[PDB]
Design a protein around this nucleic acid. Structure first.
Ligand SMILES: [Mn+2]
Ligand SMILES: [Mn+2]
Ligand SMILES: [Mn+2]
Ligand code: NA
Ligand code: NA
Ligand code: NA
Length: 320
DNA sequence: CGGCAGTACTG
DNA sequence: CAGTACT
DNA sequence: GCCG
């Protein structure tokens, strides 16, 4: 990154706006930061800064203060609440509104939350694993987790296909969590397996806590056996084979990549989700779907790219 | 002016 | 529903 | 915050 001396200051503002709930301003900062982290050379001119997509007048100004000053004075007026809001919103299941409410009620530490806050079931689990959920795991451990789920699934039906997605599939050396997609080529025998699969993984002691138990999504907590093991976040999604490519695409990400691809689809009168790529989608003036359109056949990820008019990208080049 | 992705749970 | 989460 |  040609421009760390700027980006590092901007990220502090981005996080501050984010934990305070100012989601769109934070989004603007996030995009400018990436734009600047992928510029070839250092930024040296206000009109060079303004040169970059995702950097406008306000952001060019800030970068000009940074290079002439070495500093950004807005940093000195960030509310004293922000570190605490960040502390609280790093509890799984607590976001900006919950963090702000706890702050308003006088909470300042996780000890305050533990002893005095009313927690949802999810948030109590999040708090119990507060440290573990902030830590990444080696790639090799994600493999063991993927393989544990697959062996449990295949025990019921040898035909079940299980694939670790997320950062694992984008090739990263460490992973924040494990994202396992399950389907079945027969288009049928994925149905109703969660009951048995989760029960099997629980029987082991492998699954330690459940956060979400939906008909198609599971989000929870696992821990491999033996000493030196941390609790890890595990997500499982079960999908019909007709949706495999779009589910794979979704679940592999990155998040920014998905949002970028979905924005593109919208420009073309199409819609892309975890379920399907659709065409002839009808939307209102405000960008909201008011007519569904037609599902397009997407047997493979490459088909989604092709139908969108884009060159295929392997998972590793989707790490946006 | 106003969208900024699209979707799934929770209670 | 608002809130939070997933990529 | 940015951009159409
Ligand atoms: Mn993940
Ligand atoms: Mn995950
Ligand atoms: Mn632990
Ligand atoms: Na620009
Ligand atoms: Na949180
Ligand atoms: Na008190």
């Amino acid at each position: 990154n040609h421009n760390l001396h700027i980006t590092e200051k901007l990220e502090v503002l981005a996080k501050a706006y984010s934990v305070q709930g100012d989601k769109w301003r934070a989004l603007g900062y996030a995009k400018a930061i990436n734009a600047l982290k992928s510029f070839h050379k250092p930024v040296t001119s206000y009109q060079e800064a303004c040169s970059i997509p995702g950097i406008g007048k306000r952001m060019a100004e800030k970068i000009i203060e940074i290079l002439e000053s070495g500093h950004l004075r807005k940093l000195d007026h960030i509310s004293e609440s922000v570190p605490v809001l960040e502390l609280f919103s790093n509890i799984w299941g607590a976001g900006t509104k919950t963090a702000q409410m706890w702050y308003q009620q006088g909470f300042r530490s996780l000890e305050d939350i533990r002893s005095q806050a009313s927690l949802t079931t999810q948030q109590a689990i999040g708090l119990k694993h507060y440290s573990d959920f902030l830590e990444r795991m080696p790639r090799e451990e994600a493999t063991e987790i993927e393989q544990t789920v697959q062996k449990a699934a295949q025990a019921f039906n040898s035909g079940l296909l299980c694939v670790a997605c997320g950062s694992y599939r984008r090739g990263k050396a460490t992973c924040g969590d494990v994202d396992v997609l399950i389907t079945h080529p027969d288009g049928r025998s994925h149905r109703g397996i969660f009951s048995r699969l989760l029960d099997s993984l629980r029987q082991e002691g492998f699954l330690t806590d459940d956060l979400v138990k939906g008909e198609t999504k599971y989000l929870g907590v696992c821990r491999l056996p033996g000493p030196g093991r941390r609790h890890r976040r595990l997500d499982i999604i079960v999908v019909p084979y007709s949706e495999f490519a779009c589910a794979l695409l979704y679940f592999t990400g990155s998040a920014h990549f998905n949002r970028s691809m979905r924005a593109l689809a919208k420009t073309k009168g199409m819609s892309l989700s975890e379920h399907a790529l659709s065409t002839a989608v009808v939307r209102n003036t405000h960008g909201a779907k008011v007519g569904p359109g037609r599902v397009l056949p997407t047997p493979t990820e490459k088909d989604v790219f092709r139908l969108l008019g884009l060159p295929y990208r392997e998972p590793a080049e989707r790490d946006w």
